[PDB]
């Protein structure tokens with residue numbers, strides 16, 4: 445292959461694969477920002493209630509509860525809730541259409557979504573974890589809600605992590621996402637989810653090359669091409685065979 449031609453093929457495929465990597469990055473970004481906007485809107489609607497509606501538990505149930513429910517329905521969230529400093533949490537949960545209940549048994553001050561919300565003025569986004577209420581893996585968005593400077597409680601919104609997984613999987617390209625512990629999280633090719641697959645070659649090549657920088661690596665003595673980039677605490681990657689440049 446004339447070097448001119450090989451370079452043309454390499455430049456083309458780098459552009460192609462870069463573009464697809466960016467689509468997967470965008471998917472992750474847009475998922476987060478939609479959920480943040482939602483959480484912010486809910487914060488605002490709660491905080492705009494008069495204090496009278498907020499300062500007794502029965503009023504929280506009757507005035508906040510409907511808001512949690514409507515918001516939960518509007519986005520098909522798994523759980524939407526407001527945790528109070530007395531350790532109770534007003535919980536709107538998926539599934540029997542019973543009204544939101546004020547639960548005293550959920551150990552909320554032990555939870556990262558609660559604690560961490562009180563240490564930042566931003567929305568806090570958890571890693572994926574197993575929700576204690578409905579026993580599904582969720583990503584939680586939490587926010588300490590204040591009215592005229594006084595804490596009301598900590599809002600939480602649980603979105604199934606499978607929702608993000610499914611969005612990533614639908615994207616074009618052989619793209620995939622690792623979580624903060626560098627464990628595979630999502631992939632267009634579901635086979636990459638096998639927990640016994642070794643991802644060191646890709647992850648090592650990423651470590652050397654940095655975000656969005658295309659690299660070459662080997663699999664079973666054949667050349668492949670790829671790139672990764674950080675997206676929040678996740679690492680998004682794309683790989684392909686190098687046959688496009690070599691053959």
Ligand SMILES: CC(C)C[C@H](N)C(=O)O
Nearest residue numbers: 525550555575576577602
């Ligand atoms: C209402 C909260 C206790 C729910 C949250 N998903 C957790 O498991 O901590």
